[PDB]
Symmetry: D2
Subunit: 115 residues, 4 copies
Amino acid sequence: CPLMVKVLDAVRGSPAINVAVHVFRKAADDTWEPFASGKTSESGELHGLTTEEEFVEGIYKVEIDTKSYWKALGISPFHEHAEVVFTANDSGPRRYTIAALLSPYSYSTTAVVTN
Amino acid sequence: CPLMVKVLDAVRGSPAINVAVHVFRKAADDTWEPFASGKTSESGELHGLTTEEEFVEGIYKVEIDTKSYWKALGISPFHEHAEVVFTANDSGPRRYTIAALLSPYSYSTTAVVTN
Amino acid sequence: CPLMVKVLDAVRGSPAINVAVHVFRKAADDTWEPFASGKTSESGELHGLTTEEEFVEGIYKVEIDTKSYWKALGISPFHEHAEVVFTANDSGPRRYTIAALLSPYSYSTTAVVTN
Amino acid sequence: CPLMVKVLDAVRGSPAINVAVHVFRKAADDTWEPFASGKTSESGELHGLTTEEEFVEGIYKVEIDTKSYWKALGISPFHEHAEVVFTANDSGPRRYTIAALLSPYSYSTTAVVTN
Ligand SMILES: [Mg+2]
Ligand SMILES: [Mg+2]
Ligand SMILES: [Mg+2]
Ligand SMILES: [Mg+2]
């Protein structure tokens, strides 16, 4: 599993369940090409987005649909989404965990990179 | 001043100085159009981005060039940029402050909306 | 002003107003002794906690009464308080700003040290 | 496992390994009584701190030794430690995950509470 996403809810103190996550890869013409997508599980985790064969080097954008998450909870979301952008595999293959902590007017994200 | 941006460095415990900040507004065709830009001051603040007349309701993206900031300090960064995408709604007098806290492998962003 | 505290609310996107803040300094016997205290203003800021003469090097603890803040808003909080424990060292002219971002089940705290 | 602690390093983009974590429980005389302690693993996780039988209701303080962590990495730590304080099991037994993200001048913490 080369790319995992974990999402937590800072208002309820819970995993953020059934949150849509879209991954794009920067194309040669500087446009964002669809790469992978999924929904977080009951643990707030999204495994199986991609495979080692598909996950090449490049610039990736992980978009987390925070707006739908907050709307479903009847909360006024400020952010449309989170947009985590990073270069992956530039020195060779790595495993990446993108973690995000969500509040209506704030978000924090970190990455755990393992060789 | 309807839109202010403040950037802090969590490694050095200091304002993030001379950081490029680009603001985009979502156009009718779903593309991101340039709206305002500047560089943070010695206090890590960016004032005078826009005016009350120009800052209408809409979907905005604030992109902070964190990659150049870390590279100039000789610290290896993970992200290309730190950001906030949000909806600006007129619900009485409002001033938006977008604050970002930077670390090489993480960032936090919050919005303070005041009257 | 050698020590300032700023508190923000990540649920409402606003300053956290009238929040009690207590500052302690580590005594010789390893106990926490009261040092300064106050309440945040309408801007979520607390100025005038101490003076240059009183603020010596040492280990300080800033305790923010987040539990009372959330209870007054009718939101169930997790933490008793949000905090920062740090060492204050004189390395040229220094001003400390302790900023805290609050959510019911999370908080972030940072220190900005300036000249 | 009723109480788990997970610690991440925002500078290196890694789990914070071999970080000391001390848990105290507030005693009848308002003093902090030792309750459990351990070190984070290679995954930055600390499992097996306590048992369901030992983990009664009360006010708990989770102290993370951030100072030793940063000193071992040759980084100038601002914080002495992190001090996460919360009431546990007041409505009946719950499982708690305390997560912390560390930077030299900042820290973020969240709690995941499951029934
Ligand atoms: Mg390459
Ligand atoms: Mg409108
Ligand atoms: Mg000294
Ligand atoms: Mg009870």
